[PDB]
Amino acid sequence: KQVKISGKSKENMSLLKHLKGDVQGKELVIEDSIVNERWKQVLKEKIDIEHDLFNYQKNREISKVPFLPVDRLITNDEVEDILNTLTEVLPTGKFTSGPYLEQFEKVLSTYLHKRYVIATSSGTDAIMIGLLALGLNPGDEVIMPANSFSATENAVLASGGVPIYVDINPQTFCIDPDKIEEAITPYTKFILPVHLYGKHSDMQHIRQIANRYKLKVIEDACQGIGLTDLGKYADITTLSFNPYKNFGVCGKAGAIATDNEELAKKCIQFSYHGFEVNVKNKKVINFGFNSKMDNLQAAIGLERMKYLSLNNFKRLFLADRYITQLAELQNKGYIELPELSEDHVWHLFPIKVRTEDRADIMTKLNEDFGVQTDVYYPILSHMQKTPLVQDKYAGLQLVHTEKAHSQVLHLPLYPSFTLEEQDRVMEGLFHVIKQEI
């Protein structure tokens, strides 16, 4: 009878169906949570998504479609809320530690269903501190994919750890659990899956393996906020609140989330100079970092977080539209579409095109249509031109990772993107693609 808005990816999916006529129940019920706040001012019984959420203007004039214009990633209402909260924050004089930081950590805890949240100065820092809190020693091996953002390998390397790259599932872009056990040595301590593009990795299977081999699991969920059951099978979950993520602040920040008390204590010590928790200047471990989130950014996060469920839903609506209206191109085998799944928060939108055509498709979309696309990310880990790669990752081949990487093409997708712009993207893809994969 009741259709509940949690804001999480599973319920978003059922909300999507329900609003497309397909009744999932009677009463729209909005869960009493900070992440659902902006929904309340726009969600009405007879809501029309195209008009109420996107203000669809089919005939608005469009010459260029930028892939990700940063100015549009923050709205006018967000600006007003931020200025309003800073008006109160600034005179308190508390900019590093303070009450907004604590409140942000409490709110995240509830949203993630994790007992302990340590907010950090970036996502990169979260992974780095997480590895160390979990006991990483120099030379310990960490199993992970090679198609993530460089921050992932970087956090392992900076801590003294050793990346062991394993091939991916070519459709999900995520680490193939069936390739993990092969790569376990007596020096392997961790598995580090990445929920790439917003797609959830096969965490249950990863957990079975990990318990088998007594490894720890720390996930890079920096692109995966809003995923149903995020962290259910992880020892540590890491997040980024960088301004370009599904939810971000106004600078650098991230978080570590865990259910283990002793683990949390250690993360806090590593995040702040190795001090005894809340006892300044008294070290209890060898060293630590200066890597807590700023009180000021936390105050901003408490405002920007009000838009999260609404924005994740708008991302889902966008991804659904793409998948539906481009179906004919996958039907003719010209492109491959991502699967419409509950275990996706659509941080990025990956289609697949023919390898030898991608650069041409990209150029034509831009030249003829003003449509900008991109490829996240241009270089794989084991193909970076560094002294480390040549000495350590020589002649390594990851067939699926490399092939998928050669084919992946990302389309504009973000909460303030417009349907009219999306139409131009799609109209463009049809007019320029004329060969199969």
Next chain:
Amino acid sequence: MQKQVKISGKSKENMSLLKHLKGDVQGKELVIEDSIVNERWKQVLKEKIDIEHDLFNYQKNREISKVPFLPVDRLITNDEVEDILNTLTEVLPTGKFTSGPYLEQFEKVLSTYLHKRYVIATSSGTDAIMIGLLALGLNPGDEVIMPANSFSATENAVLASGGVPIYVDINPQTFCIDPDKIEEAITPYTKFILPVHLYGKHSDMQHIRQIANRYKLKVIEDACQGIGLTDLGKYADITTLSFNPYKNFGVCGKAGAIATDNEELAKKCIQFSYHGFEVNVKNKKVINFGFNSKMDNLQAAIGLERMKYLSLNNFKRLFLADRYITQLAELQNKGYIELPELSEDHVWHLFPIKVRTEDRADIMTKLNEDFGVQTDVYYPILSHMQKTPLVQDKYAGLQLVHTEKAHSQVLHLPLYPSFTLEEQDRVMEGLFHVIKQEI
């Protein structure tokens, strides 16, 4: 034939300004260097200045029940809040919060203020030291010569980068590393000297450079408390700063900077500061790894506002320290305490006096209970006495006589730009009353 007096805002020039602004004639001889750090001076300098009244609003007869050591709400003024709100009104809608134009502009201003060719703004002073060591070519196990009485960030940066701290005794008068004790400690594994301008006092950099040259060592200074020091960085390979909110100049969150004249070195700092990428080419790595440690565009915008108060704020700190040193003279004359020396090479981030080792706890307790005067000790525990596995394992048997003795005597008195002279009166009165024994 009149000598001009340049208001650079640096420590040397502030010292002479202190005399001229105590004097009767204040005319066209006072030349304000065209710099953002001097902005808040332009308005107030167009008339004759009475420091007590114009800068401090001296209210000798005000009721004071408590003197907090560092009330953080008073470290940011109303005009600072307003300027910040005004600039953020412009920054926020641009949507640029990581990289951006205020960041580049803040680095450029710093480069001019410090007289250093390259400034790399970082996410904290702690990261500046860590990145600086790595860019200078630190390898795991490399020994770093340093004092043991700094904030923990100094040693934490050495250790996080793979370095090995080697602690050397200080000059007990200045609290800075004793150049005369550095040479003794040099081994084949020594690669760096890391002096700290502690409390805002300038280390003996010329002598340290001599030793460094002689043994081919790199010098990276922790100047995180030393912004405004004359000739800062002159003999350093890398200078590091902090713009933590509590510093002489700070932003509204964490940030710091690396300063250097060496171009190839600057390049490496950038690479380390941002994922090991080629400069201005995202996703393309040219070194093994790097960090996510640039300063944020938004904090840079706030920095460009707050920096307008630096020269004036540094001047007020000096006037405060000078006032302490003069009015407390008698306590030093009678041998009860030791006062710092009124020098040109100090920016007075903190104000250290020395009291009798045996009486300090009692002095502090009585100041607070009988008079509401809060004092403090930066920092409570020395590096070689931290209860950590590393210390208990590798730094057992290490004795640093001067560091330990001076650390047992030191007492910091409240001093920040918005501190009032009437609060200062009460600090000083309390000190006269509670103290009765010599050192």
